[PDB]
Amino acid sequence: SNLIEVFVDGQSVMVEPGTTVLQACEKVGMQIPRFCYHERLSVAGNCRMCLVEIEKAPKVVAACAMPVMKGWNILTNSEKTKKAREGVMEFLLANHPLDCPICDQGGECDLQDQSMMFGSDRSRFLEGKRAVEDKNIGPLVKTIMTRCIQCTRCIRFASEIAGVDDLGTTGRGNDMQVGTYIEKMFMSELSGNIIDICPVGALTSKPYAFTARPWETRKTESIDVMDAVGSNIVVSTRTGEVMRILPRMHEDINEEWISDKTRFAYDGLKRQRLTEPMVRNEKGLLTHTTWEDALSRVAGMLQSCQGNDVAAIAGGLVDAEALIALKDLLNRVDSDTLCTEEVFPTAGAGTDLRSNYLLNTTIAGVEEADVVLLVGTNPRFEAPLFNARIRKSWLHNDLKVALIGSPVDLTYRYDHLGDSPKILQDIASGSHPFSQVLQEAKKPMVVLGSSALQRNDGAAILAAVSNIAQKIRTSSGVTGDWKVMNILHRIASQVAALDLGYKPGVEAIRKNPPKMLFLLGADGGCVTRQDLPKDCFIVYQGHHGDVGAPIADVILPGAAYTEKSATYVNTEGRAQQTKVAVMPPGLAREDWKIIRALSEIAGMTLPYDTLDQVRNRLEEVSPNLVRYDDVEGANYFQQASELSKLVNQQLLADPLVPPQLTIKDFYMTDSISRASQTMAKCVKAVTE
Amino acid sequence: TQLITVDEKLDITTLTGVPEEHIKTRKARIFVPARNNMQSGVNNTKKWKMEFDTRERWENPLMGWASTADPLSNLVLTFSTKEDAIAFAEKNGWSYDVEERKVPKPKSKSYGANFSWNKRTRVSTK
Amino acid sequence: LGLREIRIHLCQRSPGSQGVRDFIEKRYVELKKANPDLPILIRECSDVQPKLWARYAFGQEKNVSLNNFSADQVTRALENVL
Amino acid sequence: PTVKPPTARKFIWTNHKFNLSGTPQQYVPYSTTRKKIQEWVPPSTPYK
Amino acid sequence: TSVKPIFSRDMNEAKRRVRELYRAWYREVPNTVHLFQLDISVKQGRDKVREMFKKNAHVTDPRVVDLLVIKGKMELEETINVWKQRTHVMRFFHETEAPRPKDFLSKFYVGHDP
Amino acid sequence: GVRTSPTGEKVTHTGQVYDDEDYRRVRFVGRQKEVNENFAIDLIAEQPVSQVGSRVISCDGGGGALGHPRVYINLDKETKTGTCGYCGLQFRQQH
Amino acid sequence: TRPTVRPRNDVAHKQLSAFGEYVAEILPKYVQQVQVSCFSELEICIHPDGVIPVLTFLRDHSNAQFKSLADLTAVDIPTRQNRFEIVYNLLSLRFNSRIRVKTYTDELTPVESSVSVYKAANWYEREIWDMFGVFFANHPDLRRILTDYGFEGHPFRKDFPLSGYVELRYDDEVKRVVAEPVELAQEFRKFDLNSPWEAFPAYRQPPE
Numbered sequence A: 001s002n003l004i005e006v007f008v009d010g011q012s013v014m015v016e017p018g019t020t021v022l023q024a025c026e027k028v029g030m031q032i033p034r035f036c037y038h039e040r041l042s043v044a045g046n047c048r049m050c051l052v053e054i055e056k057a058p059k060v061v062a063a064c065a066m067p068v069m070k071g072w073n074i075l076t077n078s079e080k081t082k083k084a085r086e087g088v089m090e091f092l093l094a095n096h097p098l099d100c101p102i103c104d105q106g107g108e109c110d111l112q113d114q115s116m117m118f119g120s121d122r123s124r125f126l127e128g129k130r131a132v133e134d135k136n137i138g139p140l141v142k143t144i145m146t147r148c149i150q151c152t153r154c155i156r157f158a159s160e161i162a163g164v165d166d167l168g169t170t171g172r173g174n175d176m177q178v179g180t181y182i183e184k185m186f187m188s189e190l191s192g193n194i195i196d197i198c199p200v201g202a203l204t205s206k207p208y209a210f211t212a213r214p215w216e217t218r219k220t221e222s223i224d225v226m227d228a229v230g231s232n233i234v235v236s237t238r239t240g241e242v243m244r245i246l247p248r249m250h251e252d253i254n255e256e257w258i259s260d261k262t263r264f265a266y267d268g269l270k271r272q273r274l275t276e277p278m279v280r281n282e283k284g285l286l287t288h289t290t291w292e293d294a295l296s297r298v299a300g301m302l303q304s305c306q307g308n309d310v311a312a313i314a315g316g317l318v319d320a321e322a323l324i325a326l327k328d329l330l331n332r333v334d335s336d337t338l339c340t341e342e343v344f345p346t347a348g349a350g351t352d353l354r355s356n357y358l359l360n361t362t363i364a365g366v367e368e369a370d371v372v373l374l375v376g377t378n379p380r381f382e383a384p385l386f387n388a389r390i391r392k393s394w395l396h397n398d399l400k401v402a403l404i405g406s407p408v409d410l411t412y413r414y415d416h417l418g419d420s421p422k423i424l425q426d427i428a429s430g431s432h433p434f435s436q437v438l439q440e441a442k443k444p445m446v447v448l449g450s451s452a453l454q455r456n457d458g459a460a461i462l463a464a465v466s467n468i469a470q471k472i473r474t475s476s477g478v479t480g481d482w483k484v485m486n487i488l489h490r491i492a493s494q495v496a497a498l499d500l501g502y503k504p505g506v507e508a509i510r511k512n513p514p515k516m517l518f519l520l521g522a523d524g525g526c527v528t529r530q531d532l533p534k535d536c537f538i539v540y541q542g543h544h545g546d547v548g549a550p551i552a553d554v555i556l557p558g559a560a561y562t563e564k565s566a567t568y569v570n571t572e573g574r575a576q577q578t579k580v581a582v583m584p585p586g587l588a589r590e591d592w593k594i595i596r597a598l599s600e601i602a603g604m605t606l607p608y609d610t611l612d613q614v615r616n617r618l619e620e621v622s623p624n625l626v627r628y629d630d631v632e633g634a635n636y637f638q639q640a641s642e643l644s645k646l647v648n649q650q651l652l653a654d655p656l657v658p659p660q661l662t663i664k665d666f667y668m669t670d671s672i673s674r675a676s677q678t679m680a681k682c683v684k685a686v687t688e
Numbered sequence B: 001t002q003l004i005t006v007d008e009k010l011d012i013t014t015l016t017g018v019p020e021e022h023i024k025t026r027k028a029r030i031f032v033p034a035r036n037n038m039q040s041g042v043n044n045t046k047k048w049k050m051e052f053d054t055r056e057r058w059e060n061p062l063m064g065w066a067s068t069a070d071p072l073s074n075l076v077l078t079f080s081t082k083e084d085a086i087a088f089a090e091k092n093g094w095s096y097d098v099e100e101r102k103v104p105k106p107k108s109k110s111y112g113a114n115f116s117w118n119k120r121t122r123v124s125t126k
Numbered sequence C: 001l002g003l004r005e006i007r008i009h010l011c012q013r014s015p016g017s018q019g020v021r022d023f024i025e026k027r028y029v030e031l032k033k034a035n036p037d038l039p040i041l042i043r044e045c046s047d048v049q050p051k052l053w054a055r056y057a058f059g060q061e062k063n064v065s066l067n068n069f070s071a072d073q074v075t076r077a078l079e080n081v082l
Numbered sequence D: 001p002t003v004k005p006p007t008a009r010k011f012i013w014t015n016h017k018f019n020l021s022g023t024p025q026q027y028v029p030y031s032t033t034r035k036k037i038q039e040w041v042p043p044s045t046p047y048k
Numbered sequence E: 001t002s003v004k005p006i007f008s009r010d011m012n013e014a015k016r017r018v019r020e021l022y023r024a025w026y027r028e029v030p031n032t033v034h035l036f037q038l039d040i041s042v043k044q045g046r047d048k049v050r051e052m053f054k055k056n057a058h059v060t061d062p063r064v065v066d067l068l069v070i071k072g073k074m075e076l077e078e079t080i081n082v083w084k085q086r087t088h089v090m091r092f093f094h095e096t097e098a099p100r101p102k103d104f105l106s107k108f109y110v111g112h113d114p
Numbered sequence F: 001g002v003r004t005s006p007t008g009e010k011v012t013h014t015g016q017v018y019d020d021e022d023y024r025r026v027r028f029v030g031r032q033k034e035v036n037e038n039f040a041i042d043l044i045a046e047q048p049v050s051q052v053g054s055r056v057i058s059c060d061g062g063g064g065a066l067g068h069p070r071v072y073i074n075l076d077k078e079t080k081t082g083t084c085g086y087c088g089l090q091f092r093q094q095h
Numbered sequence G: 001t002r003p004t005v006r007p008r009n010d011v012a013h014k015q016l017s018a019f020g021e022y023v024a025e026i027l028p029k030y031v032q033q034v035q036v037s038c039f040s041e042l043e044i045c046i047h048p049d050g051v052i053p054v055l056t057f058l059r060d061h062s063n064a065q066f067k068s069l070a071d072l073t074a075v076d077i078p079t080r081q082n083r084f085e086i087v088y089n090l091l092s093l094r095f096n097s098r099i100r101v102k103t104y105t106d107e108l109t110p111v112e113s114s115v116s117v118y119k120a121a122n123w124y125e126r127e128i129w130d131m132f133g134v135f136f137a138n139h140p141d142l143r144r145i146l147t148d149y150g151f152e153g154h155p156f157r158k159d160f161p162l163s164g165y166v167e168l169r170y171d172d173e174v175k176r177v178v179a180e181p182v183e184l185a186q187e188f189r190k191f192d193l194n195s196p197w198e199a200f201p202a203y204r205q206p207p208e
């Protein structure tokens, strides 16, 4: 039943026809060494390391890109196989300079490992050793092209995933410079990913460059933040502190890639942090004190204050644990005006009813989709690995990607349909040459960006897109069961806050002014002191405060995301937990621990002591927030769309636009990216 | 000599001698160590490493060092299967978290389809 | 005082869970139409006992079961809670 | 070393200060590293 | 699933051996406080002896109870001889605080231990 | 060739000096804070940048097997100087 | 091959193979493995019941003398239901050969106290009792060798960390030396040195 036998060292194994020899050897366990093969890119054959002596033939053939004929016998440990490997390894190490002390991949080279485990023990080639003058590619990536072995892997990665096409081979003979001809600062998204593509020490990190060496660090589990998708991130840590991060692999989401903001964020994570709990002072100033004074002042004011005069804006990067602790505390006082950072609208019951506030499909599940329309967003600048997934589908099989909302720099020929909600109600009617493609295609997907939802067109666009979803779902017979419709997000803590059933947005504060409020990471222009009564009493709990810290009344130095065993949810409902990597500097306790100490000092209690009891209460409140690395999509789209008909709003005539549109707004408007200097370097490098 | 023997659980935490705080407070993590992405080699896979959560490592103010009061912080136990991993972690007493194993999914790559005709798959450089 | 939150926890293969599926396909739109201030919410994860909780009155999380029930019995019990 | 005294290096001391323990002039160790984590500065500008 | 037991068949001989060991430790203490010239009355020493017996009072596997009998009997031999000096017998006590309490609040002012 | 702190003591070649609210200054009391007063940044600028009349040149550092290994560096930057990472000294080219 | 590589002597390989096959076929009651290394030193892998009969048979019988006893170490291996390994080492005075008697054992069930047949195993049993926890049944004196008296924890295990749980210091308050929980002066960086890429193809175990 469509299986071909290969005799790897006499051991027979079944292989799907058409696949490579190397995947058969990796099926039985063998690693034929490789330099120009990679398990995400196209298969070029330029490194010659993958060779193997296939029997009954006088010629050694490659195994990176060999199709499998019927009934092979593969010798991976013969005589001339080893002679070919020693020969090719002796060829590679000729025009490669002696930099292994100063090269930035001492522990993580590839020439070193494969030269030990397959290469010769003596060298030759007394003269020669050419040298290529380096370039200046960008302030993010340090570049010495002398160590470049011309392996053509950055080129294939750029041209087939980045889509930028700014890298090339130049020349002949030994003189093949891999690079960029026009002295252009190569700046794009995913350019941070190219320093792990390059298998030798030729493309290294610029700010990291000479700060560690990868045997001293220890590696630690962690979860991506400031992106809605959550690649799996491994912190190489050192000195009771950090060194760097790397992307590690989840199969479904964010395969072997990461965002540049995540990869270069940690400079701002350790630059302007908060180590002192801080109280205002009689001149009007902000000084610091011990925890007893600060928590006693907050507890006395909290025992004095009840009613509908207590608010809690929790945005930025907050936990499931801190939000559970705050919901229990704020139930325990009397009542609430919890709020989140980004205003999500609730008119067709969007807080409950699991569909309309997560990504209903799978991020990996978009490959089987066929026609995707894309209402206002910018996937290159909003969770870029989602855009890399869409480009992966666009490059492997056929798609049809149309965009409604902005003319932007997407890399793969979106079909621009205009930018107004009149276009959206016009496709709701169906007067296009593209509605036919929708309702008579096979597998449809509609991706709604959350950034086009902060405006006053929120519930109307959401209900109309859900009517599109009901139209194409109840028509055309697809599949069942499979989902046209999904939304995405920008911040994972907002997704966890919507999962816990909170009030989204500061509309509850605009309807009801409070007298006491807890700012758990108030990033942007949510509230001011002019828009609030003069006895403010903000308790801002966070880390490297630059907004809210000028608006300070009581500062509590919360921990960061690398610094606590949190519980985060991506934009598709999968609950991923962070792990302890670096203890926070200063006093800097964990957030829910601070909240439970606050409830201790105030005249009340909380019925838990440990983080395992916190996660027990988490499974009590919402059941899928402890079943780690798991997905289950929602249902009941008929009930959702029939509940979307009560509040009959209007659709404005103004054109919409996402503010996440270019490089400067990709780099500025987040806390950890704002606190750094590497972001400022690349901002002034792109603008200048 | 084939005596009375009962077939039950074990309670070896009384005999291993380490005190109660380091028994019941720290939580083990059983994980397969992920591939160090700057290299590409899965020989460092195929084991189940048990580690513990990290704790405080301050600065010794006389030399600029990283001292800690953590004897259990620098362990790793290499195991062959998840089953004996969980059996050992429940034998010796301390609470634990177990993750699962993630593999490279087998793709179907082909140079001839990388040089296609009417598909959008085209290398555009080679 | 009144109510603040009502939460539903479900699974895929149980007669009571199937009864709550029958309730939630039949008699939710009139219920949410009736009480626009109570965010009665639905959760399915993989497998859990189908529990019905009510968080109200300054931290009272009262608990009832919806295991092995019929849909009319679910409606009667929910109206007894409400 | 009346056969080859010197070396062609312009950094060697002209004193050769000997073993100096039990003095007011000896060695103490310290951290040869700059600031670690760079604590936050409150604004001197007030409000209210 | 055949296991050779150490000493006992069921918990009866385990209880018998451990109360025999407690009888020996009860009649062994004033000889130690007279010999090593300790600084602690008889009551406090006997109270920490019965504390250390009551600490492991919930183990039901008879092999483990027999092995703790062997541990206590080895320490009783090496304390009824004059081998273990004053340092180890004082090391059984904890007077060098370590006053680290088990609140939440005092564990919060000296943090990172939940 | 050293600076001097505003506290009144010598800084190192790394700007690691203390504030006024420390105590390692008071464990420096009575015994001298040693500092190598011959730095390494300024000793590069006193060296003559050699102007070698070829294209791509070699560097060892004053002695075979006594110094750093062979690094062959390129001089194709028409206005910038090629810098040995080991030596720290510059070169030019004159055809 | 001919320089720089220690050769092997297949004469001794065939001789030890035939001898181990002989011993295995004449004691079927307790034998599981007789493995021969490349460097020709025999290993006999044994169930933990026939320790005393195998040692009495291997002290005598005049086809193999092996009067000389050496070390006993029970090297601790997790991911085994029966963990520890008792390694007797036996040397013949007449024959110049070495056989490693590896019997396996668990954490609790005792092996049968080889001091009754080999007088050189007395401190070996006492020492491995102190360091591991392998009990020996009907042994005269079981005390602690190579540890402190008040110390316990069986420190050559893998669960016991490198730095111990105690740390002695003198103090003048109680005028004596006391133990506190451990406070390091440096982290003891345990480096990552397990490099990939399979340096030994001949030892690739079959995966699942």
Ligand code: SF4
Binding pocket: A096, A097, A098, A099, A100, A103, A104, A105, A106, A109, A110, A111, A112, A147, A199, A200, A201, A202
């Ligand atoms: S990439 Fe770096 S570590 Fe590897 S051989 Fe080249 S110089 Fe050495």
Ligand code: SF4
Binding pocket: A147, A148, A149, A150, A151, A152, A153, A154, A155, A178, A197, A198, A199, A200, A202, A203
């Ligand atoms: S720069 Fe690196 S990835 Fe690109 S061709 Fe050279 S060695 Fe390969």
Ligand code: FES
Binding pocket: A034, A035, A036, A037, A044, A045, A046, A047, A048, A049, A050, A051, A062, A063, A064, A065
């Ligand atoms: S893998 Fe590079 S040649 Fe086949």
Ligand SMILES: [Zn+2]
Binding pocket: F059, F060, F061, F068, F071, F084, F085, F086, F087, F088
């Ligand atoms: Zn040099």
